[PDB]
Amino acid sequence: MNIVVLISGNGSNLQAIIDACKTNKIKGTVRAVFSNKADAFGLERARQAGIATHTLIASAFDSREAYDRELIHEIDMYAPDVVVLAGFMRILSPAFVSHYAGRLLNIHPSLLPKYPGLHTHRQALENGDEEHGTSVHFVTDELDGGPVILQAKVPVFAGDSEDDITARVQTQEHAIYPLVISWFADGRLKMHENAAWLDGQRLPPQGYA
Amino acid sequence: MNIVVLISGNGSNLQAIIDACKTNKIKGTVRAVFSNKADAFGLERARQAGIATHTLIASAFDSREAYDRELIHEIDMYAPDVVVLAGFMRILSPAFVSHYAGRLLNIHPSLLPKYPGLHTHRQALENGDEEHGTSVHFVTDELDGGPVILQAKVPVFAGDSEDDITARVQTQEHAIYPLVISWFADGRLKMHENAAWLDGQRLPPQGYA
Numbered sequence: 277m278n279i280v281v282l283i284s285g286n287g288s289n290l291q292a293i294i295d296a297c298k299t300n301k302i303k304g305t306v307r308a309v310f311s312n313k314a315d316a317f318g319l320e321r322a323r324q325a326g327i328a329t330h331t332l333i334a335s336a337f338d339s340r341e342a343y344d345r346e347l348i349h350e351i352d353m354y355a356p357d358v359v360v361l362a363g364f365m366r367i368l369s370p371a372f373v374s375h376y377a378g379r380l381l382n383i384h385p386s387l388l389p390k391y392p393g394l395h396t397h398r399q400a401l402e403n404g405d406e407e408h409g410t411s412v413h414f415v416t417d418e419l420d421g422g423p424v425i426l427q428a429k430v431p432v433f434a435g436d437s438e439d440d441i442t443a444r445v446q447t448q449e450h451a452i453y454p455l456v457i458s459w460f461a462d463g464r465l466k467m468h469e470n471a472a473w474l475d476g477q478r479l480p481p482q483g484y485a
Numbered sequence: 486m487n488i489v490v491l492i493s494g495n496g497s498n499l500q501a502i503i504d505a506c507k508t509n510k511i512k513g514t515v516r517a518v519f520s521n522k523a524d525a526f527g528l529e530r531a532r533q534a535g536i537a538t539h540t541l542i543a544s545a546f547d548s549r550e551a552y553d554r555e556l557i558h559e560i561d562m563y564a565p566d567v568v569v570l571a572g573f574m575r576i577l578s579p580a581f582v583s584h585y586a587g588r589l590l591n592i593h594p595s596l597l598p599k600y601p602g603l604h605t606h607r608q609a610l611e612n613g614d615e616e617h618g619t620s621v622h623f624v625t626d627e628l629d630g631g632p633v634i635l636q637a638k639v640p641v642f643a644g645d646s647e648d649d650i651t652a653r654v655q656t657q658e659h660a661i662y663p664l665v666i667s668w669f670a671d672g673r674l675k676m677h678e679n680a681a682w683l684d685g686q687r688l689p690p691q692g693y694a
């Protein structure tokens with residue numbers, strides 16, 4: 277089972293995934309890590325793990341379509357069974373989403389449908405929500421509109437800073453992402469009729485309950 | 486629980502609603518029926534049931550805003566708890582949608598998002614669909630774009646005419662519309678964050694599953 281991970285920054289989720297393959301919780305391997313930022317430390321994590329790395333700079337391309345095309349061309353050298361977005365700060369084109377339909381995953385730092393887009397933690401905190409979390413879902417063209425597979429809620433108390441809750445959510449992300457990937461790896465997770473299904477059963481709008 | 490129904494034609498769905506109140510499946514009453522067509526037989530259905538009727542001709546108004554305004558003014562004489570569109574062939578203005586936000590329902594003759602608008606049936610046959618149906622949803626300015634509450638699928642077999650399938654879908658409409666209205670009447674159905682919620686639970690893009 278071949279996994280290709282796409283990142284943009286630190287890659288703590290990438291690390292959790294790497295560790296899960298190592299323990300075999302996930303019966304597969306991370307074949308490659310792609311980044312749109314040369315600096316991403318995640319690349320360094322993959323490097324140290326003997327995993328291949330690649331970098332595609334948006335400037336070197338003259339259109340989003342041209343960029344994803346070279347992305348698809350590159351990612352495919354590894355014959356991935358699933359493409360995983362772990363902190364990938366770049367919106368993917370419909371062509372790309374199409375090419376990996378049903379095998380493209382992402383983990384959004386909020387309790388979807390709440391706060392699609394960037395700056396989740398802040399909104400959650402500035403709006404005064406008593407509950408925050410993360411959501412792993414199948415990627416569709418709709419910015420975080422795809423079928424939610426699993427969420428991990430997290431209590432928000434007075435006094436918690438943006439970083440406090442962020443580190444709290446992160447801890448959950450490291451737990452549910454590798455898990456969702458393992459479900460996928462065992463052919464227990466699929467998507468059709470634009471819905472997420474676990475063990476053959478349809479999952480609710482907010483993921484496995 | 487006061488219900489005000491809006492129609493344009495025969496009103497078979499109106500009748501199903503009327504019958505449901507009679508049996509108390511819906512714990513409420515149709516207080517009035519409005520139509521934008523003087524001929525609509527639905528008016529006679531209401532008439533025979535001792536229900537009040539009203540007609541608002543578009544020609545008698547010089548703008549859509551003026552028309553809905555008078556419509557709101559009239560509908561409100563009946564202090565409705567919910568306004569139900571049953572075959573109402575007229576697009577309502579934002580102000581109107583706003584005035585009945587969360588308490589405005591419609592039943593579209595197709596499996597939304599598929600075939601928003603008119604000519605559902607014909608497109609289904611034509612586009613050679615193996616499945617057709619109806620969708621009850623909360624009305625938002627987006628033509629059949631609002632939160633779908635419940636759909637009723639219907640199989641399509643070679644040998645089926647546009648009338649064969651239409652009559653098949655109607656039969657379902659008479660079943661799920663009164664049902665959805667009862668959910669609403671029991672305070673079990675609500676809309677917020679532009680989503681449909683049944684028994685406190687968020688409903689999928691396709692309605693109750």
Ligand SMILES: Nc1nc2ccc(C[C@H](C(=O)O)c3ccc(C(=O)N[C@@H](CCC(=O)O)C(=O)O)cc3)cc2c(=O)[nH]1
Binds near residue numbers: 365382
């Ligand atoms: N089609 C599709 N592509 C996707 C590509 C990435 C992510 C991950 C993530 C999410 O899950 O949170 C996410 C990341 C970046 C932006 C964004 O708007 N970034 C730029 C704008 C344009 C771009 O460079 O792509 C920015 O610099 O602001 C939004 C969401 C999600 C999706 C998705 O759900 N659907």
Ligand SMILES: Nc1nc2ccc(C[C@H](C(=O)O)c3ccc(C(=O)N[C@@H](CCC(=O)O)C(=O)O)cc3)cc2c(=O)[nH]1
Binds near residue numbers: 579
């Ligand atoms: N704001 C709003 N109003 C609504 C009013 C009615 C219906 C129901 C229905 C649907 O669900 O089927 C529907 C009704 C009218 C047309 C329509 O195009 N009518 C005219 C155009 C403008 C007019 O009314 O003069 C036409 O003659 O083509 C299409 C579909 C849905 C909505 C809706 O979703 N949002």
Ligand SMILES: NCC(=O)N[C@@H]1O[C@H](COP(=O)([O-])[O-])[C@@H](O)[C@H]1O
Binds near residue numbers: 285361383384
């Ligand atoms: N563009 C996707 C996105 O929303 N990513 C989010 O950014 C953080 C980076 O974690 P990381 O250590 O896994 O890089 C994670 O919390 C992840 O959910």
Ligand SMILES: NCC(=O)N[C@@H]1O[C@H](COP(=O)([O-])[O-])[C@@H](O)[C@H]1O
Binds near residue numbers: 494497499575619658
């Ligand atoms: N513009 C709304 C719309 O498309 N309505 C549809 O028209 C038919 C009229 O039924 P009826 O008059 O016998 O209830 C119904 O099938 C309804 O879903």
